[PDB]
Amino acid sequence: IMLEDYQKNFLELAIECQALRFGSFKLKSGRESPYFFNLGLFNTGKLLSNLATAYAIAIIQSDLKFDVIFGPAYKGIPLAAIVCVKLAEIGGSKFQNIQYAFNRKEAGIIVGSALENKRILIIDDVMTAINEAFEIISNAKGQVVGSIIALDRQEVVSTDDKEGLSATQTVSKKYGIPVLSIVSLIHIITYLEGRITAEEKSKIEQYLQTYGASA
Amino acid sequence: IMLEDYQKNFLELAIECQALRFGSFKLKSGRESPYFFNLGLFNTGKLLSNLATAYAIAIIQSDLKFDVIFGPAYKGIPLAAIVCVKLAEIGGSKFQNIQYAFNRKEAGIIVGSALENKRILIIDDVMTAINEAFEIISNAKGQVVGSIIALDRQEVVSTDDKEGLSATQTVSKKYGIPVLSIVSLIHIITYLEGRITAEEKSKIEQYLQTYGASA
Ligand SMILES: [Mg+2]
Ligand SMILES: [Mg+2]
């Protein structure tokens, strides 16, 4: 009803491959969470194919205009790559010539074409690092025009500031750009209706209440 | 006649995107070469799509049996990824559950599933580094069963040993495994017939004579 078909498909695969788990989980903060998410578990050719398609459709539907998809080392490298491919495969003539690029985290160089006057989309797995990418890109004269992750957790950044912004909202405000996501926690909650009873369904909604950011 | 359709298609794209150039080029050794090759120039979604397909068909046709495709950091990360995807998309039911993996070059950890008792294919751009990958994989109890690159240059490793082995042959002998390639220099030479006259066509064949390894 609210959920697109690519979002429903992503979430069912997410649950099947165990990238999305439900139960009792303690976050790094110590806060207790009704689910756990690891995109890494999208780890086969089939799963990666579907993951790439799900990112690709979110990007096409967003209407965002860009020249280069950029994935921060290390998790963003394979993601940038498979999604660049997918865009060209299902996106039509406009997405044929989209370049991809990423960075060596040397102990900084960019692997790809010159970013000067190029509009850049950042792709990564999650958003929790962000400034690093913007720095690298702006140094190369690249203009970041957007960001996409798989799951927007929609959690307020500060505990004792319930009316504060989420991670994605914070980034979107600072750089003036959209931060897309395949799904958000509200989407998880929506998909779970009729798959669970008002038991765990409640738990998660009551977690969105306590820790979730407003639209 | 000798060249498969995926090889013809790869080479035409290679020439179109300038990843394959002809002219006078000095190698690192100082040796003079009739062509230059950079896989990096396969840099758009369309080009990456076709590159992935070309690797994927070479792998399917080879009949090699493996569980994991592994790409050495950094150039092998996106390659491992898009090709893992492609295998699942065109390879049928047998390639659905192939995992992919790579390595952080930390100043070593593997990003992916446990490699123990898993049969591994290495994918990289060229072969000139090789031991690094084998070490990493054997430590994790992974069994390397093969390697694939885009272009086999077929050059003898030692100048003053004309009957010596090529780079790929050397690796194949040391580890007892096949080292596949989308194309070799003999394939380049074959494709160029009727596209050039006996002028540069000669030059390259006379370079294969001087510097090429025997079958
Ligand atoms: Mg639309
Ligand atoms: Mg066959």
UniProtKB/Swiss-Prot annotation, chains A, B:
Which top EC class is given? transferase
Q: What is this protein called?
A: Orotate phosphoribosyltransferase 1
Keywords in alphabetical order, please: Glycosyltransferase, Phosphoprotein, Pyrimidine biosynthesis, Transferase
Binding of 5-phospho-alpha-D-ribose 1-diphosphate occurs at: K28, Y74, K75, R104, K105, D124, D125, V126, M127, T128, A129
Q: Which InterPro entries match?
A: OPRT, Or_phspho_trans_dom, PRibTrfase_dom, PRTase-like
Coiled coil stretches, renumbered: none
Q: Spell out the family assignment given in the record's similarity comment.
A: Belongs to the purine/pyrimidine phosphoribosyltransferase family. PyrE subfamily.
Whether Phosphoprotein counts among this entry's keywords is yes
Species of origin: Saccharomyces cerevisiae (strain ATCC 204508 / S288c)
BP term (GO), one:
'de novo' pyrimidine nucleobase biosynthetic process
* Residues bound to orotate: F36, F37, T128, R153
Q: Name one GO cellular component term.
A: cytoplasm
Look up the further comments and give them. Answer: There are two genes coding for OPRT in yeast.
Q: Assembly and partners?
A: Homodimer.
